[PDB]
């Protein structure tokens, strides 16, 4: 059931983002209209005729076609997004990744939509490019721009959706992304125009073609950026629900269930936040689930964290047993670092807050993993060329988090039951 | 609200403040030994005289007002003993420990334009030194060079009183550096808006981290999962931040303003209350409270002087004007630090522009 | 011991798991060795450890089950238990086997300090000093009649007096009765007492064979425990390996004459000494199985 609600909220957030984009389309159309017919000595007449053509039926038809193309683009973001970056470890792997039937289909879709957009711009650029050799050249430029856009979205992995390290009002994030998007569209249009001119040579016009390419690329970057900023919107999952019916929508289940990975990363960031500032949800995490006195919430949360951690530990000790391998063995370490920090700090606070001592019953357990994990990491740093960015993040989060837990427990940790091997490292860190 | 007005007039040009006796700043003629009941307990912290005769981000953002011309570049007192590090002008770190004629000296190939020194708490053998391009963890092949790209020039580094994690800061990097010394590992904590992080100050017990930026926004960081509360309502940048000996009162000042804003950490109170008006006086450049929570030294730069005040925590936290601490003619107070563990009251070590570091005791003389 | 214990864990029988762990725990002219004062001291302190950990596990289990009423917090555990359940604190502490928590407790509500340390921890070798005469005196004078059951029990424990008092107001489980009477320890006297005066029927071994065993074996009555558990069918094989362990350990006392009954006390032995015919044992034992499993 949680898949359906997640997918519905996702389609509606695609709606919010593509909605900001669809609201933003027509001002861009008017800007292109005023720019393609720039009369420097006749500003009033140029602006008035551009206003009349801005009310002409052909302009409305072009706007509608561009809106349909942008809707196709939003569905593309909805269909081919990613929550983990696409990394070619070998150049042949990149060439293979660009040859997929679905990715080739996406590239063809981009080329076709770009041809449509270029035709719309040419019809909006009233003049010799209105009816079908210059118009064919503009159409070819549009198609090449679409193909290049698909290829670049693949290479720079622009389909990777970056979880915001600091959550901000969508308006501010959009405003910030505005200058970069605009400059990128301009530069990419210029470079692709040069390449397309060379290609057309091998097998007024330049200004209009560059304007059309810049407008199309700007619309694409804005669609991508809006889809990101809105589809990456943080949602707080209710920790424990007054009904078992919302139990699947609670962060514990959604984190332990096989829902789409996007929701997993979202709930991860959400739980990190709640553990950072939400004290009530925290107490509910240490809540004693009735009936049974079980801290089911904290149990499942820590269980997931340590499961992912042991997985990453196995991966590091494995890929260690070359530089790309030891870089990739801990590429997934961001989540592990977040979990280590949050958990060990929660323990550090448990020496004062968990009035039921609900965390104490697993205290020793955690210690083992840490020492164990730490040990493996040392052997990891032992293989040459491995000690020469999630890896360092996990290392730092682990060391700092253990340090916090230790210096919070102070002396009362000397009463904690630990393996003597772990005890030596404990003394070392406390020292 | 405390004004600079109710303080007893500063010691005249010829008198040097010797110690705080019975709430009155006793002046001395440089040879009047402290009362013989106090001279047999003056734990001989070094009173070194370092002659000077023997970047721009780092300068404008350093703790020292005169980093360019003060041979004392940074000071740090260890959390536990009378062990204190002084940063020479040539980036060479000297470590003076009371009761030792040996001068531990540390100078790494990375030691350029030192910004700050932090004795890692609960350990007398670790000193974090902020260099131009990296952090030299000096193990008092003895220097661990920790680098996180972009986190340079390094301006503010502080080892947690947990002694287990050390924060570093960069006015050009929007992500503060969290450094785990053993793993040799650096984690970026990114923040949107405000430019780089220039001054960091974790609360006395380890929950709140006052983070001041070269912009007009200061943030409180709850150390549990590093939660961020933005207080973007400062007319300018934050000059300094002083935590209560208890860590529930964060004292701050906005450079350009001469007020002491007291943020009560009772989700802090969404506004700051004016507590001590240091209007001239002048720019409040540094502020320091004794670990006992009874004495507070506030560095006012216009001769720069230490406004020394006694604070009453109950029933209303207020600043009371106690006196002025000044240096000799031409001696501008460059840096100051209250020794964390002076057992008989308060020990305020003041480093002056000539490099001469003097010790002023505030005697908690029970009536 | 290790081989049998690993066999037992794999066998998945609870009681046997317990008894075997106890065998190990308690195990760490054999007749002369069994009776040596140091040997008695060791067997005792070992059983005391066993019981200490046992009741402390009981404390852990009860508190973790009764969290809601416990207000466990993050000295503490005993307070939590006392909620579910100054003299009371130390009593219930020592009966969970952690003397140091009770030590903190006595420290908080405190020449008497050197004396206290002498009682618990400090060796306190002294010259021409008089000890345990003064304590028993006052105890008989005032404490013996005190209305504080825990206090009088603690006095009994410290001064080795009033051994008659079951002090059952604060001692309800055979576990306790042992722990106390032990802590008051002449070894053969109590040996006969539990073996002879109490006898089997008191121990109602029918349900708790493992108990009556633990009772015997804790008191270094090895031949007894062996014999008793031997009478049981389900326990047979166990005691066998047990006996064998003791045999090589130079820790089993054998009977001299073949036709002796399985348990035998020989003349002139220090009282409570018993002997068992390890041969006659193994013979009668294996006899049931020789026709089938020769290689065995």
UniProtKB/Swiss-Prot annotation, chain A:
Q: Which residues lie on this side of the membrane: Cytoplasmic?
A: 1-13, 79-103, 156-185
One matching Pfam family, short form?
Ndc1_Nup
Signal sequence annotation: none
> According to the lineage, what is the superkingdom?
Eukaryota
**Which GO molecular function annotations are given, in alphabetical order?**
protein-macromolecule adaptor activity
The Gene Ontology CC terms held by the record are:
nuclear membrane; nuclear pore transmembrane ring
In its keyword annotation, does this UniProt entry include Transmembrane helix? yes
* Transmembrane intervals: 14-34, 58-78, 104-124, 135-155, 186-203, 205-225
Answer whether the UniProt record assigns the keyword Nucleus to this protein. Answer: yes
Task: Tell me the keywords, alphabetical order.
Answer: Membrane, mRNA transport, Nuclear pore complex, Nucleus, Protein transport, Translocation, Transmembrane, Transmembrane helix, Transport
Q: Which GO terms describe its biological process?
A: mRNA transport; nuclear pore organization; protein transport
How the protein sits in the membrane? Multi-pass membrane protein
Q: Would you identify the family this protein belongs to, as annotated?
A: Belongs to the NDC1 family.
Q: What is this protein called?
A: Nucleoporin NDC1
Origin organism is Xenopus laevis (African clawed frog)
From Swiss-Prot, chain C:
Picking any one GO biological process from the record gives:
nuclear pore complex assembly
> What is the protein's major site of localization?
nucleus
Could you name the domain of life of the organism this protein comes from? Eukaryota
Q: What are its GO cellular component terms? A: cytosol; nuclear membrane; nuclear periphery; nuclear pore
Q: Which UniProt keywords apply?
A: Membrane, mRNA transport, Nuclear pore complex, Nucleus, Protein transport, Translocation, Transport
Instruction: Please list every transmembrane segment annotated in the UniProt record, as residue ranges.
Output: none
GO molecular function list: structural constituent of nuclear pore
Where it sits in the cell: the answer is: Nucleus membrane; Nucleus, Nuclear pore complex
What does the sequence similarity comment in the record state about its family?
Belongs to the nucleoporin interacting component (NIC) family.
User: What's this chain's function?
Assistant: Plays a role in the nuclear pore complex (NPC) assembly and/or maintenance.
The protein, known as:
Nuclear pore complex protein Nup93
Species whose genome carries this gene: Xenopus laevis
> Which part of the entire sequence is included in the shown chain?
206 to 547 of 820
